[PDB]
Nucleic acid binder design. Structure first.
Ligand SMILES: [Mg+2]
Ligand SMILES: [Mg+2]
Ligand SMILES: [Mg+2]
Ligand SMILES: [Mg+2]
Ligand SMILES: [Mg+2]
Ligand SMILES: [Mg+2]
Ligand SMILES: [Mg+2]
Ligand SMILES: [Mg+2]
Ligand SMILES: [Mg+2]
Ligand SMILES: [Mg+2]
Ligand SMILES: [Mg+2]
Ligand SMILES: [Mg+2]
Ligand SMILES: [Mg+2]
Ligand SMILES: [Mg+2]
Ligand SMILES: [Mg+2]
Ligand SMILES: [Mg+2]
Ligand SMILES: [Mg+2]
Ligand SMILES: [Mg+2]
Ligand SMILES: [Mg+2]
Lengths: 322, 376, 111, 158, 46, 109, 217
RNA sequence: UUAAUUUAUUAAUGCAAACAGUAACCUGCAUUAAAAAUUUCGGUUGGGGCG
RNA sequence: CCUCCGCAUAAGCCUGCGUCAGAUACUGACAAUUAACAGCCCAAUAUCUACAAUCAACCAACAAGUCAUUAUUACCCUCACUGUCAACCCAACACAGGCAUGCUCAUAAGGAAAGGUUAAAAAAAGUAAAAGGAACUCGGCAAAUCUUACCCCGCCUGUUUACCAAAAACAUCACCUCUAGCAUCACCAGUAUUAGAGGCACCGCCUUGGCUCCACGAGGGUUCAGCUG
RNA sequence: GCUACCUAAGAACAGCUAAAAGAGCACACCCGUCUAUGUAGCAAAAUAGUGGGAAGAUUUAUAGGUAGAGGCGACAAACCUA
RNA sequence: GCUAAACCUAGCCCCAAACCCCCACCUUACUACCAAACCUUAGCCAAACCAUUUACCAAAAUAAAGUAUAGGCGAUA
């Protein structure tokens, strides 16, 4: 029995809880014709495409923002492959699952025939990023292994099902987006969009100001941890033979309009109790505040466009292995 | 012999009481009570119609009383119809002449494979958490990565930054043939569209040669045989884009099939017919968007390509529409079928024989690369 | 309100208002160490999440960020002196997660 | 539905027997209603109609249980109401012929308040009666303002 | 073999076979309910 | 096989458990994804007055006087409402266009 | 029982219909026919038996092109999917009609006996005397109910002023009206009767179980 | 069952009964069949049976 | 030191070893299973769908097969409700029995055959046994070591008397004979190469058959060899 | 809700040999040949070893249908809630 | 001297008189909201078997009278 951890989650303070489940310290910050094509694809998927069945706002996310990111990422890869030869041999998956299964800590069985026994408490992330870009050569590291980070990872005092998180028993899958015998096994950029349930319009219909930032951060921590951990376990490290080189990836999480960018570095797979009693390292996730790409659409133009957001997508697609 | 067995059909409502026969006295019914009683003759309730209308319980009006009703029998070729005669019924419907070979222009444009083995393996071997990915899973992955390979060959050919691919665009086009009014509806595949119209591929000499050339007949099969006999249809023609759309000219139509069930898949000839009708629909919709709606012979022909489904077996098509004068001179279609990159893929070892493709060939991928690169 | 026939809504009728609510909830001490900003409530069976959220928003001016509910089965296992079963009732429990980090903590009544 | 002895001999088997009548689909004109009815008659009805000198006379003369049909008594109260109201039965331009009809059957004339209740079952009679006395309630605003107006007119008189 | 357990429970079979709706469908089942009601039974059906 | 215990939503196969439910009133309707559409008008709105600056409070004093019972009969309400008829010497004829209809009740509590 | 018969379909569809087995049982739920039950699961191809059924707002004698001869699990012959005009349908295929032949459906009574091929269908006035025919109808227009099983061919023995005489394959004679339509030639799946069933398993796949107590007496 | 009694029920005839005429289905009464249906199967006996 | 065990879902139960207090897993009190998993679906009128599956690719069939929408009309209001515990269910029992599916292949999970002695008989189970090797016995039953052939019956694989009979009986391909010329609630959406009923027993040769006749059997007997309390 | 048969939509069948066969050996499962224990039993038919089938005329979950001189039956007067 | 034993009213029986009874709930009842009733009782039982027959039951004081009457003319009615 393992907790199904959901990256795209409705729960409150899931960033803090996933920091606990994952052993990440979260640090805010970071470690032309492109504007024409971004505006073109954006206006194509909102206005310029003709619609027979008229589009509702329950389906607007998966009919609008999903092909928008699909074509935007594909064309940005196509137009940045001259500037960077890493995106020539890269593999580009559209909605391919990224599972990672890890054990983190222990519990005492509360009741039953097995009452009072030690049970390692398992988790599994089952994720489908919108689209991701994978390399055959490892990216940079942003930071040497075992950094200082005097920020003190949270210390969750309840059971992990008070954040509504639920146990199930199903197949234990560790999956980078492609199988193990695939040369393009490392990854460097991953693009998520938040679903219809997680509209920040709905969260402001509900009762917050910063829990939009919390859902962006939770998706970041869980998705990137699963993807870098799956890369590590593919390279042969596991919770006993911990990683030697730090693993790394990058993710932008959007909701169609708002974007935010994250960089993740995995230093530990030693998460279990016996492998974590004397483990000073911790994984590190760097995050940006959410920022809007465009403001509104008046059927032939995008009013307030954001060069900062477009250039950050470019930079994330633009680094490369050494 | 009439189908529709009596026991399954609705029985006759029971005979009324004879107080309804006797004139003139009003029967005493259980309408004053608000329930059935088995004495007290059953009333005849008036036909109740909801005065307003709920969205959730709509009963669509009968097909006579619709706003746009056309008395002539119409036909629609939407994405599902599978033609009997296939390619020759397609040719008769669209008034074209067929060419067995791809043109020397795109062959000269023909005149890396590590990544091609990577795409074949990534589609049919490596992409899913279990073994043996299905056709719904591997076929769009193949065509998507081949489009990505061309958008990587951007470096050698720098004018591919003027063409974007569209995911869910519909379209429509209508014409006459006898006269009898036909129609084609939109795809669901990829529509690679560019900002600059495609070059004319055959000259006026070949145009007049096809004018001399005649069509074929396939009696007693009428040429409408698997066309959906459609009622009210909104005859207005449509390239599925609002006006002023950048990248307007449809370069290539990528038609793909999911549904790994063989009875659900298209046959090769029916798939070539689908490509021919869809290329003609897109080309004619572009022709009536640019020029007038009149029936004439175009001085500037339009060219639209198409690529077929079923990632193992490929079909390529180039369609030159030079006439919208239907009911003379004929359009041209250079097709080729069953290119068959990766003859077969053994996914599990057999007991000897390793995992992976068998019967591989790259000249078909060369044809794909050319057929992408024809515009620039 | 409970044990009241609700007026049917057809398509574009008025909103259902309630004056003089029939719903009486009570704030309970959690049994199993729920977090900060989780209040626990015991609630009538006919009261939804949306009803409890609007109850607490309007009557008490508590900003509610999430409501979760469950139905607790009470034991039917006790027996009388007649060997006939005694049913402890079934109730509904809600878990209210506060907004803006308001962080309720159950006071120590009965010092 | 009875028993019978096997060979018309009581010292023999006794054994069930059902004697049914013979049934015809005959078409009848009734001069009072002016309609052609097709009904399932038997020779006894046909003979009773012949000795009654017509279907109209048979149904108006025969008693409730000698007629013994819910339909037959529906026909009776339709005919009786036709007579009791003296309706424009065929149409105008023949009022002398209508007078001939109602004069031919003038003897079986009863009040309308009786002919409406002729022939009903008890279930129909109770249903008809409660339909008569439904009477959607009178608002007590109306009742009390009537009382108050009466009292104020009494005070104005006094 | 060992023949103790002919009762293999399922609430769908229980409700469909002996339920109130089925009792009330048949006119003999209506009399079954009427008999339990007269006997005074606390449970008239499944 | 308890006939005597109550039948609830905890007490059947998976379909039975999904269909029964406690007595909570519906709040919307279910369509075509098994997706649920909540209708705002079907959701009841609590109408709560502003109680600030108020003197009525949840008990009275024992120094309050005793007064005998008089239920509000329609005649008493009538006389208290139309003494202006006596002055001369309001009523609803039907209730189709009325929001809070009296007899086939439109309102809650 | 709650026996709605599965054959509720009204429109003539060409697609197979999911066919429900019966177990040899009435609507009452009890066994009526013994020895039935548990075959391979099959699907019913809706055969049009009116061989001369001209399509909507059309004329007399017309042509059809055979598309596909096919095994039918629900009978003993082979079914030909044929196409003519704007519609296509299943018919019982006579022997030696491959995929590609062309067949003729004529209601015309030519005075001379038409020199016709083996596949097509005409009324018995156009058929000659002593002629091998299979799909035979009693009254004109009802549709063929006689010889249409696998390999059977009834002969036309003589033509009379308003009628004709058919030797049905039971060595029988039947008077038919002159104007009714019949297909010439013998039906496909000849050699079918010389198929040894082999195993009791093969019988149980065909859908016939061993059944005892066949006389509820 | 080739024992007694019955065909009430089904069936196929016949006779009437209810239609069309021109110089089939329903009902009543008989019959022979089928399925049945009811009912019984004495006594003495050097155990009971056989005789 | 043990275990076809264990964990999960389904079905079934319905709070049934959680805390505290009390009396002699009992009694009472207090707690608890939180939706993302699962269930509770679908606005229709007309209409479209000949192509199996089996790595589906050659290739192979017969017993002929489950997965599929379109033109238009109306439809943006959005995430409620319910299941969620346990040592559990059906067998009167804390019953050596019954119990579907996924996963682990000896377990990372789960468990304990001995209350304490003594060491009689009889009884149960096991292991070992000189010499001999079926002399036992109805019979090599049981054990021990593995094998040969002949007959009888039934052609075969199958089925059967739940709880004393598993067979030579029943069924079965094959064959014969009898009845039936036809449409819509079985047979049948069938048509004499079809359907219904009965009987015999495969097969090669010949016309109540007969003679051969191969394979199979927890059937019924017989022989040799070994092996053994 | 057992059991007999049927209907509807499901599922299971290791390995080796073999190469679509009511195939061979043999697990899972289904059955119940022989013996031994047991007999108020663990059990109103079980246990232990031995055995037979185990890709099919197979087994099996869920829902439904046939009802008492009736059903149902690969006939055993078998089964239809010990 | 243990186990016990003892108890009297909880009620009941037969008559007379008088004619009696907010919500949810036929879908899987106890679930807010969607396109049809009407047809002879049979048999055990007596006849010492059983085969016509065999009390009453399907409102009717006392007597007429167990009479007229019926009936394998017999049991019986
Ligand atoms: Mg004697
Ligand atoms: Mg027991
Ligand atoms: Mg352990
Ligand atoms: Mg001891
Ligand atoms: Mg020895
Ligand atoms: Mg001896
Ligand atoms: Mg001896
Ligand atoms: Mg032995
Ligand atoms: Mg045998
Ligand atoms: Mg036995
Ligand atoms: Mg058995
Ligand atoms: Mg046995
Ligand atoms: Mg055997
Ligand atoms: Mg086998
Ligand atoms: Mg034996
Ligand atoms: Mg059987
Ligand atoms: Mg026998
Ligand atoms: Mg016997
Ligand atoms: Mg007697």
């Amino acid at each position: 029995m393992k907790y199904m951890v959901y990256p795209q989650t409705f729960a409150l303070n899931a960033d803090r809880w996933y920091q606990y489940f994952t052993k990440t310290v979260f640090l805010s910050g970071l470690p032309a014709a492109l504007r024409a094509v971004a505006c073109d694809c954006l206006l194509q998927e909102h206005f310029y495409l003709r619609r027979r069945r008229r589009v509702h706002r329950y389906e607007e996310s998966e009919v609008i923002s999903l092909p928008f990111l699909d074509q935007l990422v594909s064309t940005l890869v196509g137009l940045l492959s001259p500037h960077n030869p890493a995106l020539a041999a890269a593999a580009l998956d559209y909605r391919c699952p990224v599972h990672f299964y890890w054990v983190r800590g222990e519990e005492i069985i509360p009741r039953g025939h097995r009452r009072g026994r030690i049970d390692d408490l398992r988790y599994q992330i089952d994720d489908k990023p919108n689209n991701q870009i994978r390399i055959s050569k490892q990216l940079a590291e942003f930071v040497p292994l075992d950094y200082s980070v005097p920020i003190e990872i949270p210390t969750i005092k309840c059971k992990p099902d008070k954040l509504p998180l639920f146990k199930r028993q199903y197949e234990n899958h560790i999956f980078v987006g492609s199988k193990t015998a695939d040369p393009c096994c490392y990854g460097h950029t991953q693009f998520h969009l938040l679903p219809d349930k997680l509209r920040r319009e709905r969260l402001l219909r509900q009762n917050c100001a910063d829990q939009i930032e919390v859902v962006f951060r939770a998706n970041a921590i869980a998705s990137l941890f699963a993807w870098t951990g799956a890369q590590a376990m593919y390279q042969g490290f596991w919770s006993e033979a911990d990683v030697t080189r730090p693993f790394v990836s990058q993710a932008v999480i959007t909701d169609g309009k708002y974007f935010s960018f994250f960089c993740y570095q995995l230093n530990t797979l030693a998460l279990t109790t016996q492998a974590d009693q004397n483990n000073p390292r911790k994984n590190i996730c760097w995050g940006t505040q959410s920022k809007p790409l465009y403001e509104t659409i008046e059927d032939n133009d995008v009013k307030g466009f954001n060069d900062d957001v477009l250039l950050q997508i470019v930079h994330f697609l633009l680094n490369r292995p050494k | 012999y009439e189908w529709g067995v009596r026991s399954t059909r609705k029985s006759e409502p029971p005979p009324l009481d004879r107080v309804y026969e006797i004139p003139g006295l009003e029967p005493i019914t259980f309408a004053g009570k608000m329930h059935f009683v088995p004495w007290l003759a059953r009333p005849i309730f008036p036909p109740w119609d909801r005065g307003y209308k709920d969205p959730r319980f709509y009963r669509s009006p009968p097909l006579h009383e619709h706003p746009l009703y056309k008395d002539q029998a119409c036909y629609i070729f939407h994405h599902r119809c599978r033609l009997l005669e296939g390619v020759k019924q397609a040719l008769w419907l669209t008034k074209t002449k067929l060419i067995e070979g791809l043109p020397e222009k795109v062959l000269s444009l023909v005149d890396q494979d590590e990544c091609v083995l990577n795409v074949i393996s990534h589609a049919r071997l490596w992409q899913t958490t279990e073994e043996i990915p299905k056709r719904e899973t591997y076929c769009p992955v193949i065509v998507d990565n081949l489009i990505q390979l061309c958008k990587s060959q951007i470096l050698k050919h720098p004018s591919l930054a003027r063409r974007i691919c569209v995911q869910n665009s519909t379209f429509s086009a209508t014409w006459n043939r006898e006269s009898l009014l036909l129609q084609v509806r939109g795809s669901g595949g990829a529509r690679l569209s560019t900002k600059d119209p495609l070059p004319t591929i055959a000259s006026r000499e070949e145009i007049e040669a096809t004018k001399n050339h005649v069509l074929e007949t396939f009696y007693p099969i009428s040429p409408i045989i698997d066309l959906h006999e459609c009622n009210i249809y909104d005859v207005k023609n449509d390239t599925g884009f609002q006006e002023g759309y950048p990248y307007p000219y449809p370069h290539t139509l990528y038609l793909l099939d999911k549904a790994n069930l063989r009875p659900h898949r298209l046959q090769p000839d029916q798939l070539r017919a689908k490509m021919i009708l869809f290329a003609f629909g897109s080309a004619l919709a572009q022709a009536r968007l640019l020029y007038g709606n009149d029936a004439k012979v175009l001085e500037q022909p339009v060219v639209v390509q198409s690529v077929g489904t079923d990632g193992r077996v490929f079909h390529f098509l180039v369609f030159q529409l030079n006439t919208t004068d239907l009911d003379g001179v004929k359009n041209l279609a250079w097709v080729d079928s069953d290119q068959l990159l990766y003859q077969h893929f053994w996914c599990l070892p057999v007991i000897v024989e390793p995992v992976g493709p068998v019967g591989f060939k790259p000249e078909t991928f060369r044809k794909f690369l050319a057929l992408y690169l024809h515009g620039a | 309100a409970r044990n009241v026939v609700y007026p049917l809504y057809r398509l574009g009728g008025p909103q259902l208002r309630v004056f003089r609510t029939n719903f009486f909830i009570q704030l309970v001490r959690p049994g199993v160490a729920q977090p900060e900003d989780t209040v626990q409530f015991r609630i009538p069976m006919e009261m939804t999440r949306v009803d409890l959220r609007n109850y607490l928003e309007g009557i008490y001016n508590v900003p509610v960020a999430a409501v979760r509910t469950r139905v607790q089965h009470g034991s039917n296992k006790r027996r009388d002196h007649r060997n006939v079963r005694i049913k402890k009732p079934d109730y509904k429990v809600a878990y209210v997660q506060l907004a803006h980090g308001q962080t309720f903590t159950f006071p120590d009544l009965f010092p | 539905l009875g028993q019978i002895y096997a060979n018309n001999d009581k010292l023999s088997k006794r054994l069930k027997k059902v004697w049914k009548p013979q049934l015809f689909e005959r078409e009848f004109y009734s001069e009072i209603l002016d309609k052609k009815f097709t009904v399932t008659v038997t020779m006894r009805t046909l003979d009773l109609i012949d000795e009654a000198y017509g279907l109209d006379f048979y149904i108006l003369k025969a008693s409730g249980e000698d007629l013994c049909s819910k339909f037959g008594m529906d026909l009776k109260r339709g005919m009786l109401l036709r007579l009791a109201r003296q309706d424009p039965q065929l149409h105008p331009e023949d009022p002398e012929r209508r007078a001939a009809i109602y004069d031919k059957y003038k003897e079986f004339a009863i009040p309308e308040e009786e002919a409406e209740w002729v022939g009903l079952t008890l279930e129909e009679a109770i249903e008809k009666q409660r339909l008569l006395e439904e009477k959607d309630p009178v608002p007590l605003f109306k009742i009390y303002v009537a009382e108050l107006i009466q009292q104020l007119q009494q005070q104005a008189l006094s | 073999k060992a023949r103790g357990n002919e009762y293999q429970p399922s609430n769908i079979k229980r409700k469909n076979k002996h339920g109130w709706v089925r009792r009330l469908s048949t006119p003999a089942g209506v009399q079954v309910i009427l008999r339990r009601m007269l006997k005074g039974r606390k449970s008239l059906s499944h | 096989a308890d006939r005597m215990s109550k039948w609830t939503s905890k007490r059947g196969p998976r379909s039975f458990r999904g269909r029964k439910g406690r007595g909570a009133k519906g709040i919307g309707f279910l369509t075509s994804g098994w997706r649920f559409v909540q209708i705002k008008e079907m959701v009841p709105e609590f109408v709560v007055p502003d109680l600030t600056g108020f003197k009525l409070k949840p008990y009275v004093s024992y120094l309050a006087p005793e007064s005998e019972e008089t239920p509000l009969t329609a005649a008493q309400l009538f006389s208290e409402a139309v003494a202006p008829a006596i002055e001369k010497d309001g009523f609803e004829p039907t209730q189709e266009g009325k929001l809070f209809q009296l007899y086939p009740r439109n309102f809650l509590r | 029982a709650n026996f709605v018969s599965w054959k509720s379909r009204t429109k003539y569809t060409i697609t197979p219909v999911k066919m429900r087995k019966s177990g040899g049982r009435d609507h009452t739920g009890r066994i009526r026919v013994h020895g039935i039950g548990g075959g391979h699961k099959q699907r019913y191809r809706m055969i049009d038996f009116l061989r001369f059924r001209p399509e909507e707002t059309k004329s007399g004698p017309f042509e059809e092109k055979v598309i596909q001869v096919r095994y039918d699990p629900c009978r003993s012959a082979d079914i030909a999917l044929v196409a003519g005009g704007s519609r296509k349908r299943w018919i019982i295929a006579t022997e030696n009609m491959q995929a590609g032949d062309t067949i003729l459906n004529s209601n015309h009574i030519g005075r001379m006996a038409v020199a016709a091929r083996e596949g097509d269908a005409h009324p018995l006035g156009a058929l000659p005397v002593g002629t091998l025919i299979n799909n035979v109808e009693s009254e004109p227009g009802r549709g063929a109910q006689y010889i249409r099983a696998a390999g059977t061919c009834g002969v036309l023995l003589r033509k009379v002023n308003g009628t004709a005489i058919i030797q049905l394959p039971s060595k029988r004679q039947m008077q038919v009206l002159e104007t009714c339509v019949a297909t010439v030639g013998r039906v496909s799946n000849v050699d079918h009767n010389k198929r040894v069933i082999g195993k009791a398993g093969r019988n149980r796949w065909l859908g016939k179980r061993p059944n005892s107590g066949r006389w509820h007496r």
